[PDB]
Write an enzyme that holds these catalytic residues in place. Sequence first.
Site, PDB file in Angstrom:
ATOM      1  N   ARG C  54      36.853   8.933  59.845  1.00  0.00           N
ATOM      2  CA  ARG C  54      37.173   7.609  60.332  1.00  0.00           C
ATOM      3  C   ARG C  54      38.262   6.894  59.590  1.00  0.00           C
ATOM      4  O   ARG C  54      39.159   6.291  60.197  1.00  0.00           O
ATOM      5  CB  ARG C  54      36.020   6.719  60.276  1.00  0.00           C
ATOM      6  CG  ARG C  54      34.955   6.834  61.326  1.00  0.00           C
ATOM      7  CD  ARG C  54      34.027   5.760  60.722  1.00  0.00           C
ATOM      8  NE  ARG C  54      32.727   5.764  61.336  1.00  0.00           N
ATOM      9  CZ  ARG C  54      31.758   6.593  60.959  1.00  0.00           C
ATOM     10  NH1 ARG C  54      31.823   7.485  59.952  1.00  0.00           N
ATOM     11  NH2 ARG C  54      30.657   6.471  61.653  1.00  0.00           N
ATOM     12  N   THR C  55      38.210   6.911  58.266  1.00  0.00           N
ATOM     13  CA  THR C  55      39.306   6.275  57.540  1.00  0.00           C
ATOM     14  C   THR C  55      40.642   6.930  57.906  1.00  0.00           C
ATOM     15  O   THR C  55      41.594   6.204  58.149  1.00  0.00           O
ATOM     16  CB  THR C  55      38.987   6.375  56.055  1.00  0.00           C
ATOM     17  OG1 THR C  55      37.724   5.690  55.904  1.00  0.00           O
ATOM     18  CG2 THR C  55      40.089   5.827  55.164  1.00  0.00           C
ATOM     19  N   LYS C  84      43.694  26.865  41.890  1.00  0.00           N
ATOM     20  CA  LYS C  84      44.755  27.643  41.222  1.00  0.00           C
ATOM     21  C   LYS C  84      45.718  26.836  40.342  1.00  0.00           C
ATOM     22  O   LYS C  84      46.943  26.755  40.519  1.00  0.00           O
ATOM     23  CB  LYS C  84      45.583  28.446  42.254  1.00  0.00           C
ATOM     24  CG  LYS C  84      45.053  29.870  42.426  1.00  0.00           C
ATOM     25  CD  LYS C  84      45.905  30.946  41.726  1.00  0.00           C
ATOM     26  CE  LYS C  84      46.021  30.829  40.199  1.00  0.00           C
ATOM     27  NZ  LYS C  84      44.724  30.832  39.538  1.00  0.00           N
ATOM     28  N   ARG C 105      42.840  10.047  49.893  1.00  0.00           N
ATOM     29  CA  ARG C 105      41.427   9.850  49.632  1.00  0.00           C
ATOM     30  C   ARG C 105      41.141  10.949  48.653  1.00  0.00           C
ATOM     31  O   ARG C 105      41.543  12.107  48.840  1.00  0.00           O
ATOM     32  CB  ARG C 105      40.582  10.056  50.849  1.00  0.00           C
ATOM     33  CG  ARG C 105      39.225   9.633  50.455  1.00  0.00           C
ATOM     34  CD  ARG C 105      38.282   9.734  51.605  1.00  0.00           C
ATOM     35  NE  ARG C 105      37.813   8.416  51.998  1.00  0.00           N
ATOM     36  CZ  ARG C 105      36.545   8.001  51.962  1.00  0.00           C
ATOM     37  NH1 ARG C 105      35.504   8.741  51.594  1.00  0.00           N
ATOM     38  NH2 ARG C 105      36.319   6.766  52.355  1.00  0.00           N
ATOM     39  N   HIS C 134      38.410   1.138  47.283  1.00  0.00           N
ATOM     40  CA  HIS C 134      38.807   1.452  48.625  1.00  0.00           C
ATOM     41  C   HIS C 134      39.532   0.203  49.198  1.00  0.00           C
ATOM     42  O   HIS C 134      39.118  -0.256  50.273  1.00  0.00           O
ATOM     43  CB  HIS C 134      37.533   1.822  49.380  1.00  0.00           C
ATOM     44  CG  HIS C 134      37.741   2.399  50.770  1.00  0.00           C
ATOM     45  ND1 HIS C 134      36.746   2.893  51.467  1.00  0.00           N
ATOM     46  CD2 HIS C 134      38.896   2.552  51.493  1.00  0.00           C
ATOM     47  CE1 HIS C 134      37.252   3.344  52.594  1.00  0.00           C
ATOM     48  NE2 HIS C 134      38.536   3.136  52.603  1.00  0.00           N
TER      49      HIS C 134
END
Lengths: 310, 310, 310, 310, 146, 146
Positions: C54-55, C84, C105, C134
């Site tokens: 959703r974000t 890696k 995010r 956020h």
Amino acid sequence: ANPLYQKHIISINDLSRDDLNLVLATAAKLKANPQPELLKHKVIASCFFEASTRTRLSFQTSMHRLGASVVGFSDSANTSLGKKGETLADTISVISTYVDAIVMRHPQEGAARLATEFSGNVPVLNAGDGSNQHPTQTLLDLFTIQQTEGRLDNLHVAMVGDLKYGRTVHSLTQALAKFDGNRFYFIAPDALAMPEYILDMLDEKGIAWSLHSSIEEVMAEVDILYMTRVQKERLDPSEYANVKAQFVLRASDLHNAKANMKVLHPLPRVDEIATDVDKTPHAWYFQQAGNGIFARQALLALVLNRDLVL
Amino acid sequence: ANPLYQKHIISINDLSRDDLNLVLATAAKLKANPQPELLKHKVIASCFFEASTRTRLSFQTSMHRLGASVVGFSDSANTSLGKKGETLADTISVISTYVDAIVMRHPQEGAARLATEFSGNVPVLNAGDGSNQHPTQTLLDLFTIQQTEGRLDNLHVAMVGDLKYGRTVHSLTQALAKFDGNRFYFIAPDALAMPEYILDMLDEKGIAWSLHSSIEEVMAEVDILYMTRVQKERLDPSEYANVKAQFVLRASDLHNAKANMKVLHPLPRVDEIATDVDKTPHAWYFQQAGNGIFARQALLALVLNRDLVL
Amino acid sequence: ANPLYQKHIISINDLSRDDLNLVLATAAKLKANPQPELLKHKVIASCFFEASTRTRLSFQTSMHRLGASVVGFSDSANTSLGKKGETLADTISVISTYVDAIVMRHPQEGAARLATEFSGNVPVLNAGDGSNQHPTQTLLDLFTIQQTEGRLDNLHVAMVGDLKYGRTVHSLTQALAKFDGNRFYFIAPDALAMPEYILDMLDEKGIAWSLHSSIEEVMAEVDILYMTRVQKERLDPSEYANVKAQFVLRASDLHNAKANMKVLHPLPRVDEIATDVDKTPHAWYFQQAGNGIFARQALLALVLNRDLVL
Amino acid sequence: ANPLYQKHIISINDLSRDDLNLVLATAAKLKANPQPELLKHKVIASCFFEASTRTRLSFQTSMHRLGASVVGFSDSANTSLGKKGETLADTISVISTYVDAIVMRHPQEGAARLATEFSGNVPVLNAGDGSNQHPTQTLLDLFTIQQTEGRLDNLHVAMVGDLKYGRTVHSLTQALAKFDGNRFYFIAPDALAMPEYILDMLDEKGIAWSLHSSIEEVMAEVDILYMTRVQKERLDPSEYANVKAQFVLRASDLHNAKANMKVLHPLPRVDEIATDVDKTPHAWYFQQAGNGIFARQALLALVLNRDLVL
Amino acid sequence: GVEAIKRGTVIDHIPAQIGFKLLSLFKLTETDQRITIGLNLPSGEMGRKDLIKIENTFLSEDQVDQLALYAPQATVNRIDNYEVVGKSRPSLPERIDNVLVCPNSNCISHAEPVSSSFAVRKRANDIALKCKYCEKEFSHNVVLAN
Amino acid sequence: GVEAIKRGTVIDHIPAQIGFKLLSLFKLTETDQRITIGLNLPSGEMGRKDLIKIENTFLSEDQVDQLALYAPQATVNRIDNYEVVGKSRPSLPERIDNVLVCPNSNCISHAEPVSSSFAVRKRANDIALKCKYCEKEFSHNVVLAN
Ligand SMILES: Nc1ccn([C@@H]2O[C@H](COP(=O)(O)OP(=O)(O)OP(=O)(O)O)[C@@H](O)[C@H]2O)c(=O)n1
Ligand SMILES: Nc1ccn([C@@H]2O[C@H](COP(=O)(O)OP(=O)(O)OP(=O)(O)O)[C@@H](O)[C@H]2O)c(=O)n1
Ligand SMILES: [Zn+2]
Ligand SMILES: [Zn+2]
């Protein structure tokens, strides 16, 4: 030495009416008078390359109930080092240098038969080879049919469910088609019917069989009601869930069932036999699992012992 | 026949002060004078539907240390055929037709209790049923408390860590609250405190208990220091790692600990007891694991044997 | 230059009251007056290393409504970077060599603030860094409270649910605490209470708050009711279901609410708001989600545009 | 408003003959006359919760050829929605708060029709809902039959392969059954036969059909040969390989075909059409895939545009 | 009131909207005997109540007590030949089979062919109901939820 | 038997055991309004019948019709001043909402906030019911196996 001594048990089809009977007599003896140190000092391999806990715990408890040591694995995934290039031939070629018998279940047909070719003279026992044979299942079904009914000849056996892909129902028909006077009532969906060749073998021998739409059509005639588990995933969700009023068993449908009738089922069970069928006298599938120990004990005692005194 | 003969061990709560004691006496006997062929010819099922190797290897070594055969599985995933629709009821209904006892650990509470209902008369033993009971753990904790201390009455027991969700700390409090004169010092984070009902049972019996902020506040009074493992994932990373100067044990904090004090811990241990605590005399958690064998051996000997001569 | 021109938006605490009224005034104007070619020829990286659909879809629909191009990924389901030895620093030093803004995010707290050191002159907008900030969710909430209440000052705001872990409620309490005479009611199970350092800052500013036990207590005086998801897994199952009855909202509960009362929820809404509140005029959580678009556009217009005449 | 303006395209049965000639007339016109800025500034969600790459890439190349922006995902490989109580309803209520059309593929039958209740005024186009419908695949097929045969009326159409499960063949038989004098030949292994309710509707409309055993029987009179994938897994391996020889098409089989005969296949084509048919003028399945673009554009132009002058 | 029965049980003065719950929950309705029911009456002081008259069936001591969580004011009239030869009141039993759903989502009772059973304790103020299986304890409020 | 009413509906001639289905499914008990329910009433005329009388309530049009699949012989009667003013029989509807379940485990109706809706098609030896959602057709026998 007994008939089955050091012999490979791979298919119901390869064992004669007399071998079946010898297996069932032994089994009934071991059941009554347990010989807990018969296989003392043998090491048996329990090689499940496909896993099944019930079969594996019936078989390992059989080995232990006769005092044998077990070494083995279960899988349906990467075993251990046994995966990279090690052909089944090579796996057997190495394990038959350690053990005294190999019980193996495997996902592809004829795996226990290819195995026989690399065992040397270590007997292999087929706990399931894909959709081909599962002879140990059929011996315990026959022992239970026989033990509730007194015989294996002149029985009216109804077989229900997935008669097309059920491995157990095709082995059991073959087996009971080595005895006299049997009548089979096949009750299955059109999509999951008894394969033509079972039926054609049944005709070559003059054996009476009939296709029926539902269980309450044969309810009163049937001595044994062998249910099999209808598999959801082989059918469209709307298709499976339809079939008018289904082919599931419930206690009230058992009201016009004969006194001697038993409902057998190889298990798992989920949909096809409802919980109220459990408290009815006709419920015989958990005792049917119990009889796996005696069928399996007998088979390991005869294959591994020369002259079997019981 | 002894009190616990053919009886289901499912909860500490269902066993009386006299049963606890009978378990601990037997255990101390088997420890001294091992009877390695007592359960000879029994087959026991070790059904771990949730896996734990320590518990499973304590229990299977207990069975073997008393000469019993084992059949079983471990899991935390798909077992084998046991997954598709086979209800636990049905699984037990089939396995109680093979074995002589069922030791089972399972992820949901009351699984061993529902099992009792389908065992027939095959005793089930609870190796952990979710966050509800783990009575076998508590018997070995009590045997070790008792064996380092000489008694289970009038002890000052400190319990540390996750007193809110630690299964072992709530069973052990109940158990030691069946003996006289005990004083408990509870040391835990506000977020992980002793649940009100433990405390309320403790009050109905007049048992003295107290909440303390840290271990060095009770250090000198404590006979037993029962540490439990604080779980990182139940806490925010910054939260867990904070708590001022923590509730971890280190060797220097043991300098003003009584001579007879032992630090017990059910294990795994990682953070809460530092390696230097190992070479101190007060380190008793590995010997505590060792005493699992005698507690578990006793419990299988009494449940499975009529009159136990030791 | 407008004051946010070329700024990295990493935390609410970094933004002033005026920066907050600036983003919120623009969002209003872009809702009224759409600007579909404003970021044309700009490429924005949408780096969701922790997948939050959703974000992500809200952020990339925003970027598309000003004509920017989007490139990016959602890891969780994995790509190649992250493992890696690919340090996040090195990843950002490569990505900002060809995009114009980075929306990211991340699971570790502090990650957006580290991107900032290596992107040089490409702006980094925080779509969520662990349990820290956020900013963009607080700007759509404040936009939704402003849009509905007409003000951001002098409100009666009830924070209900998991107040201890809810990232969302901590940022909103800090953001509204910058405006005057806000009054807070916190309704939370005690295990999930609003952590001391938020309450501490409220005191220092002379901002009123109280804790109430049921929503019924405060319904009458409340303008904005912010529900948070009680993560079921934050309690044990029997702790979760057994509060006194619960802290779930149903339409009946709302019958004393003021006409201007809005129910807000960051979503997912599992069961804390019953289905029947949806039909109420007060249910505002989907409309709230839709202003994520406007608040998210504001940011990208302001960071990337030197001057804005809209 | 054109008649599909703002309609949700969920099933073939919902569309009339005229709606079908409307979509197909537009596709023709957009193939001739490309309209690359028609949906500019429109954002379309491409929600593939069940990953089907070909349908997805075709749908999103279509959206790009009218200048729409695309946002969306393919789950199967997972994202975040679908789990954690996120009901599909709630997901659609959030997504249609910022897109203009929703193209979705879902595993449960009925899902597109439920989206329709919650999207309000954003159109929902079905890219496949379980074993139910797939309208957009039938529109590209009908477009390919029309394009090649010049008509949709009076055809001789052979449906070959897995007729029972093939979603694709059920929709085409229903769609062509709306046009006149179509004649159907069904060639299928009996386990996979065309299910009664399709045959039932054909009868009710006086539409001719027969079942033939080999393609050889009917090659001469056929205009459109629609092959479906016999899912190998739908039969056991020995049932699959052992039909009489098979129902696979090879170029030799085509030597009696009419010049206008086209071989159609929804793809994947594994082995039902041999490699050497590709070189034949009759092989039309890749050209068929390419008209998915045109038929898929038609829809998005018609649903989203009030009036169309092309 | 409706009027009178020859032989059977009359449960009277069940609150209101609890009457259907009792008929369904405890299956009173699967008899072949004539049951007549009054939902939202008066004729047992209060105002409105429910009444269930089941004839030729009489309830055991424990069946009466089962009604105590729902109906506790209810009087269980044992009727023989048009007169009330007996009147019982629901009182708390110590176990409540089959009728409640354990609040604990991870309790095994859910998945399985077992009847629920709870241990009841305390009285009047809060009734604490403890699970047979998960052995977790809940307030009767929370158990009577969903 | 149970006595007559002033105004309301009396749903007479329900076959046995269906009268309780009708209360549950059509939620008729959820009104604090006088209901008289007689179950397993004799009436030589059917052996056994059930009869719900809901006072001062008028089941109109569609409501009557929804009973068609359960008790298709029920005489629905209006009484709006001391006696029978209208008499009605359940007629099969073209659609049946809320009460049925989709037999398809993979229909999305099963997890979601959604009222079942089925379209009624009477196909000679039975009635077919086609789901709104998954669009599959079922013998009502399968939708009421349930
Ligand atoms: N043959 C009978 C007799 C009485 N009743 C019912 O039995 C209850 C009356 O019990 P009873 O002890 O006779 O009356 P009281 O309890 O004295 O009445 P109340 O307390 O209302 O004065 C009522 O439910 C009335 O409907 C009945 O159904 N059939
Ligand atoms: N105010 C009224 C009037 C009539 N009734 C009842 O309603 C039916 C009378 O309606 P009517 O159709 O005239 O009677 P019947 O002939 O019994 O109906 P049918 O033969 O269809 O059963 C009866 O069952 C009687 O119980 C009632 O309850 N209240
Ligand atoms: Zn429980
Ligand atoms: Zn459906």
